[PDB]
Amino acid sequence: LKVNQDGSQVRLRDVAKIELGGESYDVVAKFNGQPASGLGIKLATGANAL
Amino acid sequence: QLFGMVAQHPDVLTGVRPNGLEDTPQFKIDIDQEKAQALGVSISDINTTL
């Protein structure tokens, strides 16, 4: 990020917590009380469901 | 590995070959962020110039 007046260097570690997380935490899915995820498929108009 | 296996069994498969290009040497430029900030130069300027 920046280097101070002395040799000290300010990395992004020093000002934040970097972790690999979801884009949005709004939606949470459970299957029988277990953590899970899924896809909700919506059929296109004028298409056969089967 | 698959090409080796297909080199075996020449009675069935013939002329197998990649459709693409093999890896070629490339020139890699490593910009030292610490040195770049030590001078007044900015990464955007370096990349734009290059």
Residue B10 exposed, middle or buried by CB count within 10 Å (0-12, 13-18, 19+)? exposed
* Collapsed DSSP state (helix, strand, coil) of residue B47: helix
Distance separating alpha carbons of residues B38 and B34, to the nearest angstrom: 6
Chain A contact set for B34 (CB, 8 A): 3, 9
Chain B contact set for A9 (CB, 8 A): 34
How was this one solved? cryo-EM
**Residue B39 contacts A where some CB pair is shorter than 8 Å:** no
* Cβ pair B32, B39 in contact under 8 A: no
- Pairing, β A29-31 against β A9-10: unpaired
